[PDB]
Structure 1
């Protein structure tokens, strides 16, 4: 196979600023017909990849003219003249001159924005779920930045560990924030022995931890 190598593999950039993604191939990509089939795709989160530049420098119709590509031999570059918030996602360089077609590793473009503290919400388990013998308490951290956030769960003021899992979304295309959901899983019988359920949030946008809580069980 022809090995495609991208640089950097992660690219933080403030909107309005230019960006450059380098692509190096292990072989030259000029086909016997004279064309160089070196292309660039952008895969936004939860979506299929989308073609930006085909055959080194040709912008695919519909793509904004802020994207452009150049290169020859084994060195190729994708440029974004002024980065917009919607450019977040993973950039791949692809070669299809020789079989098999090969892609680079991907370069995640990250948008740098102002600090935004999360809106915190807590949700008790539903009554329908409690009938089933399990209790899920959900804590939502909504639209914060940067991605660094800590959620601590407390039941009757006792700090929990090993009974919660979380996941965070990819950076938003419009406001460049992240969102986090954390689930505390207890059995119905343990959930019913306690009154106070609380999630405590530490984020750089908060000058002191924010606690959302509810009483019942």
Structure 2
């Protein structure tokens, strides 16, 4: 098969600046009929891919004119003039001259809209979950940049560890911010043996570690 190789796999860039992704093939891609079947697709979060550029330099209908392609032989390049918030996603270069069709690894676009702190929200477990012998406490960070955060759960001021998982959404289309959701899991038995429940949240967009808490159980 033809291997496809994109240059930066992770490209962060501030709005209104130039962005440039390279792509490179193990062989030349000129079909016998004369055309060069090399393309560019973009995948946003929670969507299928969408064609931007086809046959090196042709923009697909709908695509803004700030996107453009070039190249010949083995080296090809996607260029964006003015990067905006809606450009966030994964950029794949593809080859269709020979069988089988092969894509590149993908290049993620991060936007360098800077510094913004989270809006924290603790949640006690529901009254109906507690019937079935388990208790889930949820700490919600919301709309923050950069992505780097740290959550420390504390129960009766005792730092808990290795009993909670966290999950994080992709960078948003509009505000260009992330959101996070940690979940401490305890038994019903152990839940009732304590009272003060809290998540401590450190982030470089905050001055001092904000913390939110409650008490029952």
* Equivalent position SS for 1:24: strand
Partner deviation per Cα, 1:94-143 (whole Å, 9 max, x = no partner): 00000000101101111111200011100000011111100000000101
Residue 45 of structure 1 deviates from its aligned partner by 1.2
Residue 193 of structure 1 deviates from its aligned partner by 1.0
Structure-2 residue corresponding to 1:7: 7
* Equivalent position SS for 1:127: coil
Residue 64 of structure 1 deviates from its aligned partner by 1.1
Residue 66 of structure 1 deviates from its aligned partner by 1.1
Structure-2 residue corresponding to 1:119: 119
When normalised by structure 2's length, the TM-score is: 0.99
* Equivalent position SS for 1:147: coil
* Equivalent position SS for 1:119: coil
* Equivalent position SS for 2:86: helix
* Equivalent position SS for 1:128: coil
Residue 40 of structure 1 deviates from its aligned partner by 0.2
Separation (CA, whole Å) in 1 of partners of 2:15 and 2:172: 13
Separation (CA, whole Å) in 2 of partners of 1:141 and 1:193: 27
> Over aligned residue pairs, what C-alpha RMSD do you find?
0.6
Name segments (4+ residues, structure 1) moved above 3 Å.
none
Residue 65 of structure 1 deviates from its aligned partner by 1.0
* Equivalent position SS for 2:129: helix
Partner deviation per Cα, 1:40-76 (whole Å, 9 max, x = no partner): 0001111111100000000000011111101110010
Structure 2: gaps (5+ residues):
none
Separation (CA, whole Å) in 2 of partners of 1:53 and 1:118: 37
Separation (CA, whole Å) in 2 of partners of 1:122 and 1:66: 43
Structure-1 residue corresponding to 2:211: 211
* Equivalent position SS for 1:143: strand
When normalised by structure 1's length, the TM-score is: 0.99
Separation (CA, whole Å) in 2 of partners of 1:125 and 1:163: 16
Alignment of 1:10-159 (within 5 A): 10-159=10-159
Separation (CA, whole Å) in 2 of partners of 1:7 and 1:172: 24
* Equivalent position SS for 1:131: helix
